[PDB]
């Protein structure tokens, strides 16, 4: 009953104001033994996806409200290398999607 889809995570974030319990940060996954080049996240952190890290947004692709911050989380991840799907959420709970590895974004909430 894993919450990792665009609609499940977006609805969760907007209701609970945090990610569901299957998410761990990049640092936390690295410390567990995640080696990006080996595509081994599912072996070292079973059931987990990477998420919760601050997203810089220095290229101004996402709208920037002064004082507000963005964070990202992986979507649709089950095993292997990470994919190119990410949910982006602000401290005001605006929610955006990318499926092209942060090239472009579209609003979903
Ligand atoms: Zn770019």
């Amino acid at each position: 009953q894993v919450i990792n889809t665009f609609d499940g995570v977006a609805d969760y974030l907007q209701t609970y104001h945090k990610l569901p319990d299957n998410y761990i940060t990049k640092s936390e996954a690295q410390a567990l033994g995640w080696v990006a080049s080996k595509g081994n996240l599912a072996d070292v952190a079973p059931g987990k996806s990477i998420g919760g890290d601050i997203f810089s947004n220095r290229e101004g692709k996402l709208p920037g409200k002064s004082g507000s911050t963005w964070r990202e989380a992986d979507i649709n991840y089950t095993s292997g290398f990470r994919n190119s799907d990410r949910i982006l959420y602000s401290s005001d709970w605006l929610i955006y999607k990318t499926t092209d590895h942060y090239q472009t974004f579209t609003k979903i909430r």
Side-chain angles (χ1 to χ4, degrees):
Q1 291 310 300
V2 197
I3 306 183
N4 73 343
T5 57
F6 275 109
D7 288 306
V9 179
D11 290 342
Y12 195 101
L13 283 162
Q14 290 200 316
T15 301
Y16 297 101
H17 305 121
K18 53 171 174 112
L19 289 165
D21 293 344
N22 53 301
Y23 282 97
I24 56 174
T25 61
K26 277 185 91 193
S27 295
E28 289 174 329
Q30 287 164 179
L32 285 159
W34 172 56
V35 177
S37 306
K38 299 183 151 151
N40 69 349
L41 181 63
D43 291 310
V44 312
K48 306 291 194 224
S49 307
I50 301 200
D53 294 301
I54 289 173
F55 176 77
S56 306
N57 192 34
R58 307 193 207 70
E59 278 166 39
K61 298 198 158 180
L62 296 167
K65 191 171 160 192
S66 28
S68 288
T69 46
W70 286 96
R71 286 177 190 272
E72 47 162 308
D74 284 22
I75 292 293
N76 296 325
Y77 178 80
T78 49
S79 63
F81 285 94
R82 288 164 78 196
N83 63 23
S84 64
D85 294 347
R86 308 280 176 269
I87 186 162
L88 270 291
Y89 57 103
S90 71
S91 42
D92 309 296
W93 308 105
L94 287 184
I95 310 293
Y96 283 71
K97 157 166 183 182
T98 177
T99 51
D100 62 5
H101 225 98
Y102 316 97
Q103 281 180 102
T104 64
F105 300 92
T106 50
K107 186 175 168 74
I108 59 176
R109 306 289 189 278

